[PDB]
Design a binder for these strands. Structure first.
Ligand SMILES: [Mg+2]
Ligand SMILES: [Mg+2]
Ligand SMILES: [Zn+2]
Ligand SMILES: [Zn+2]
Lengths: 116, 49, 184, 77, 107, 242, 107, 162, 50
RNA sequence: AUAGGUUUGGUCCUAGCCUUUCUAUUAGCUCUUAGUAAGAUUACACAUGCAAGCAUCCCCGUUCCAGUGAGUUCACCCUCUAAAUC
């Protein structure tokens, strides 16, 4: 299909039922639907933690690189995933979130101390 | 420095090829400039309502 | 219960003989070719309806990973295939159970099945590649320092802060310097 | 989704979209992170592009490929 | 088949289905099939079966009671056998009738 | 001096093992189709036999012995800022159809924001999950428990067990090795070494025995049947080893 | 190199009734997938012919033109591969009829 | 029974069996062959049996048949370069001719193997789809993970019932 | 193949209109200062520029 | 189709109709719970509410997503080249 110059994107996609989210990381057109067609499917990601606490992620890094070269952008979740992997740097947003969490924890601790 | 995994991969590749090479892999932002966000664009390229 | 004894016994011999459990049984149905799946359950509530599925008609016939002979009776000798439900004419639930039992037996090694000699998945058996062996550690790692410098918090110069304040006069929040380095 | 030829809602017109307030120091830090991270990302992208180009070259008029072609020609002859 | 001793096989009955005709025809068919021994006798050679279930291992079924023909069978390629269409279709997967591979009671 | 893939040694091992065409190519309990009957002359028959023998040899060429792999206790990088925020781990695996499965990059992020190169046990499992194989179940199945193994052994069923092991754990694995050793032990005690004589034995039983110095039983077995030359060969091999 | 699909294509000549343009029919073999027999389906093709050298019944081959030089013609008569009647062999290039040499070899 | 003289020509399997896959260069493979001539039997045989197979192998190349244009049977070719291969078939058996063809304008086995490999590469294993293209639809199907609420339902963790 | 002449004509007309009666930007860069909106468009300005 | 029923005083042949199997709609008559998929008949007519904003003003976006199956060989391949993305 012909779109108005919609860029390429490496993006997640819901391949799950209700309450089981399963993800499909996928090189697709920006203006395509979420679960609609794509250019080339890449490494499936699972968010629900499987038997003995693993949250497994596939990645065809070799083809991801190619896609990047060809000029395909990355959604924020994808970027985060990459950072986690060690393929990209940690997305600064993630870092900030972590910091915030830490701060919150500290506050909680302080409150507890006050109480006691 | 490269990000953790890419660098490792590169190292592995190097090893496979043959050379040991203790010189670490690195990327340079001498080429990559950072014109700020408040830097102005161009009215030739924009469309008017 | 704890069966195999029943199979061994004289009663069993009297009843069936050399032939299997299901040879007598015949599904009764509309003419010619029968419905392609068998009835769901022989027994409802505690009742037993119709001519029962060869297992259901007898109390003593149980199904588990230890009734080896019985399980075999519902599998080919020459193929390793578990008979599809309408071959034997067994109950659907019963069939399911039977299959499960067979699987269990296989897992345990209480029932023979072909274990074919595969090739090894990797045709090269070396652990030299970085992949598995060992990468030379990073200088940052050695130091005890993050990958990239900007991962940590640097306190901004005050001028910048002032500028920010000026920019967002009405809309501001009071803030801390750096965060902690732990979180219980 | 609305298609621009529709009127837009009557509750919507009287709605001031007031932005979030800002922590200064934190904001600056965030900005810094964005600056740095993006540079790295750009570099990575460039590298990838270069790799792709190299691959293309290899495919087309890379030396090995050329040699192969020559060999084929010879065989044909 | 049961009466005979024939235990496991496929058979399609086409044309009419007069019972008498079917029975007699069947009987005739069963009478007029060469043994492997018979084949061996006819040809010399060895009737060697090669199973896919077993390995490449050549199992010899029926060797000839007497001499042996040293001239091998001339493998005249693309052999003319006026062959059935239905079988071909089955092999291909062109025909798919809903009444074909139906789960039935034992025999 | 030991060298498993020294050709002479291999030859010797082959010699020690039988062919027994019927045992290599046993009637399998699979989905059968009707056979395909041929009309062979004597020469043709001979040729066929030769081919069969060759096939058998090919089948029985594998496998090697590799020792236990060393566990992977390495770190790519260790971030302290994540600290236990995004909990429950993450397991990132490089995928690529044109890469061998030992040259992969399988990586683990933990709550204590580290980046491990993954355990050996982990890695294989991950590979299986992404590249399924005929055999290889993802969790380690119930057959390789002790009691079950013992039961299997009791039904004089060792070859099958070996095959299963091969299918499951990669030959550098620890568990696999252990299983093999157990099997060998079983074979030794209350002996039936003629179960494994067209397999899966050539290195497995013999080499291991030689290494241990538990050759005596084997020698006895050789004596009892006939196999004097084979026994002599074995002895020679042992001598070479020590 | 060229926009058109058929680049080299052999065919038989029907109509010269139009200036510098031979109408040549081409016949591929097509597999009727039920029968699986290759039946010889056909398709007309105009072709530029500079000199009007070609006559009806000729067997020719047509090179693709870089661009179609009219609505229906996109080919050039590259060579007359068999002239009508006056057919010379590719092997032992001598005048012949059907199945018979006129100027015999050994000359 | 099937209506042909040799009904194995139309079995699909037979077609597949044809070994010759043409090199990329060819465009037209024109055969010319005598009908009543006793010497050119091989050519006739080839026309009868193998031509169909060849076509099946390579459907884009144009195959033309000519009956009595000349005395001696022969095959002539046309490449994208514009050259012309000319193989006289007379005296040979069909098999021999086929072999010759393979040698001349037929691909190697190696090339075929490479092609096959490439094809395989295209259809990946570790990715998920709907059967037709990819093995296994969802990662509930792989063992040791959360197993699709359709079969075994999820615990009270599930939203809206929490 | 049918020709869609009418559509083409319409397009042409639209183009002409754009060329001619286009708003000379006195009109559409205007600002009502008290209400912080705009003539022609009608939409408000963002808060961070008031 | 592993087929069966059915022309006739009967028999054989040829034959159509039907039966038996598996889906999906409605229909009657009935019905405990849980999880999950699927869910106008109709390019007939529509009340009400909502479905596109964002953003230091320009812009960019609302030319996508979602919907329907009215009409219908533009959807696959090559050749060329405009967006449009690095
Ligand atoms: Mg009557
Ligand atoms: Mg319609
Ligand atoms: Zn029941
Ligand atoms: Zn699922």
């Amino acid at each position: 299909k012909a779109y108005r110059g919609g860029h390429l994107t490496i993006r997640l996609a819901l391949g799950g039922c209700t309450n089981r989210p399963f993800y499909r990381i996928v090189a697709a057109h920006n203006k395509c639907p979420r679960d609609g067609r794509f250019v080339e499917q890449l490494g499936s990601y699972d968010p629900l933690p499987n038997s003995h606490g693993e949250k497994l992620v596939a990645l065809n890094l070799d083809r991801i690189r190619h896609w990047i070269g060809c000029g395909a952008h990355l959604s924020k979740p994808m970027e985060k995933l990459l950072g986690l992997a060690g393929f990209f740097p940690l997305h600064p947003m993630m870092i900030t979130n972590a910091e915030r969490l830490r701060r919150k924890r500290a506050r909680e601790v302080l409150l507890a101390s006050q109480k006691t | 420095p490269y990000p953790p995994l890419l660098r490792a991969m590169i190292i592995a590749e190097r090893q496979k090829n043959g050379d040991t090479s203790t010189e670490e892999p690195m990327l340079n932002v001498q080429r990559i400039r950072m014109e700020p966000w408040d830097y102005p664009a161009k009215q030739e390229d924009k469309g008017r309502a | 219960d704890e069966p195999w004894k029943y199979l061994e016994s004289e009663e069993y011999q009297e009843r069936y003989g050399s032939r299997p459990v299901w040879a007598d049984y015949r599904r009764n149905h509309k003419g010619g070719v029968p419905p392609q799946r068998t009835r769901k359950t022989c027994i409802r509530r505690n009742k037993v309806v119709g001519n029962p599925c060869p297992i259901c008609r007898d109390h003593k016939l149980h199904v588990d990973f230890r009734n080896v002979k019985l399980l075999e009776q519902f599998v080919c000798a020459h193929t390793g295939i578990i008979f599809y439900a309408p071959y034997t004419g067994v109950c659907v639930k019963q069939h399911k159970r039977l299959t499960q039992a067979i699987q269990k037996a296989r897992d345990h090694g209480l029932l023979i099945y072909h274990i074919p000699q595969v090739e090894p998945r990797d045709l090269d058996f070396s652990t030299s590649h970085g992949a598995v062996s060992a990468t030379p550690p990073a200088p940052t790692l050695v130091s005890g320092d993050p990958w990239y410098p900007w991962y940590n918090w640097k306190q901004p110069p005050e001028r910048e802060l002032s500028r920010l304040r000026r920019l967002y006069q009405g809309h501001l929040q009071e803030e801390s310097g750096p965060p902690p380095e732990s979180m219980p | 989704r609305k298609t621009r030829h529709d009127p837009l809602a009557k509750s919507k017109i009287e709605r001031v979209n007031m932005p979030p307030a800002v922590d200064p120091a934190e904001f600056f830090v965030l900005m810094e992170r964005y600056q740095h991270y993006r540079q790295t990302v750009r570099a990575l992208r460039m590298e990838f592009v270069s790799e792709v180009q190299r691959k293309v070259h290899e495919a087309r008029a890379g030396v090995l490929a050329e040699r192969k072609a020559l060999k084929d020609a010879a065989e044909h002859r | 088949c049961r009466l005979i001793g024939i235990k496991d096989m496929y058979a399609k009955v086409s044309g009419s289905i007069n019972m008498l005709s079917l029975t007699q025809g069947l009987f005739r068919g069963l009478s007029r099939q060469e043994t492997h021994q018979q084949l061996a006798d006819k040809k010399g050679l060895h009737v060697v079966e090669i199973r896919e279930e077993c390995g490449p291992l050549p199992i010899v079924v029926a060797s000839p009671r007497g001499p042996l023909r040293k001239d091998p069978e001339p493998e005249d390629e693309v052999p003319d056998v006026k062959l059935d269409w239905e079988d071909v279709k089955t092999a291909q997967g062109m025909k798919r009738s809903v009444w074909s591979n139906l789960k039935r009671a034992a025999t | 001096k030991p060298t498993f893939m020294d050709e002479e040694v291999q030859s010797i091992l082959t010699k020690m093992t039988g062919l027994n065409l019927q045992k290599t190519f046993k009637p399998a309990i699979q989905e059968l189709k009707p056979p395909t009957y041929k009309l062979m002359t004597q020469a043709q028959l001979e040729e066929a036999t030769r081919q069969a023998v060759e096939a058998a040899k090919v089948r029985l060429k594998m496998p090697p012995v590799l020792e236990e792999r060393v566990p992977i206790n390495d770190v790519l990088a260790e971030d302290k800022i994540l600290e236990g925020t995004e909990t429950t781990k993450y397991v990132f695996t490089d995928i690529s159809y044109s890469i061998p499965h030992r040259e992969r990059f399988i990586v683990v992020r933990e709550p204590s924001g580290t980046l491990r190169k993954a355990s050996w046990e982990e890695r294989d499992r991950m590979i299986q999950v992404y590249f399924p194989k005929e055999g290889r179940k993802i969790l380690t199945p119930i057959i390789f428990k002790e009691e079950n193994l013992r039961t299997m052994y009791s039904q004089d069923r060792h070859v099958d067990v070996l095959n299963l092991c091969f299918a499951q754990f990669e030959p550098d694995s620890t568990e696999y090795i252990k299983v093999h050793h157990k099997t060998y032990e079983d074979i030794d005690k209350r002996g039936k070494y003629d179960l494994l004589r067209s397999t899966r034995y050539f290195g497995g039983m013999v080499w291991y025995f030689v290494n241990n110095k538990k050759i005596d039983g084997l020698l006895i077995d050789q004596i009892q049947r006939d196999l004097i030359d084979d026994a002599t060969n074995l002895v020679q091999l042992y001598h070479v080893l020590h | 190199r060229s926009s058109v699909h058929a680049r080299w294509i052999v065919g038989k000549v029907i109509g010269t009734k139009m200036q510098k343009t031979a109408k040549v029919r081409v016949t591929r073999l097509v597999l009727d997938p039920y029968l699986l027999k290759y039946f010889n389906k056909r398709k007309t093709y105009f072709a530029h012919d500079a000199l009007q050298q070609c006559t009806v019944g000729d067997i020719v081959l047509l090179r693709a033109l870089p661009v179609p030089r009219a609505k229906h013609v996109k080919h050039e008569l590259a060579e007359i591969v068999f002239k009508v009647g006056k057919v010379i062999d590719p092997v032992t290039g001598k005048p012949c009829a059907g199945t018979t040499y006129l100027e015999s070899p050994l000359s | 029974p099937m209506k042909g003289r040799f009904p194995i020509r139309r079995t699909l399997q037979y077609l597949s069996q044809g070994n010759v896959v043409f090199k990329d260069s060819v465009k037209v493979m024109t055969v010319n062959y005598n009908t009543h001539g006793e010497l050119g039997e091989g050519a006739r045989k080839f026309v009868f049996f193998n031509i169909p197979q060849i076509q099946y192998k390579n459907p884009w190349v144009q195959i033309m048949m000519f009956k009595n244009m000349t005395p001696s049977p022969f095959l002539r070719f046309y490449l994208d370069s514009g050259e012309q291969v000319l193989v006289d078939v007379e005296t040979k058996s069909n098999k021999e001719i086929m072999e010759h063809i393979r040698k001349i304008l037929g691909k190697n086995e190696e090339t075929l193997r490479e092609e096959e490999e490439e094809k395989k590469q295209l259809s990946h294993p570790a990715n998920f789809g709907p059967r037709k293209y990819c093995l296994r639809e969802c990662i509930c199907e792989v063992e040791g993970q959360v197993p699709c609420p359709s079969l075994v339902p999820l615990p009270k963790e599930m939203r809206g019932k929490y | 193949v049918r020709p869609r002449l009418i559509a083409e004509l319409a397009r042409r007309v639209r183009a002409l209109r754009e060329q001619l009666n286009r708003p000379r930007d006195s009109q559409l860069y205007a600002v009502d200062y008290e209400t912080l909106t705009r003539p022609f468009s009608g939409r408000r300005l963002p808060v961070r520029a008031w």
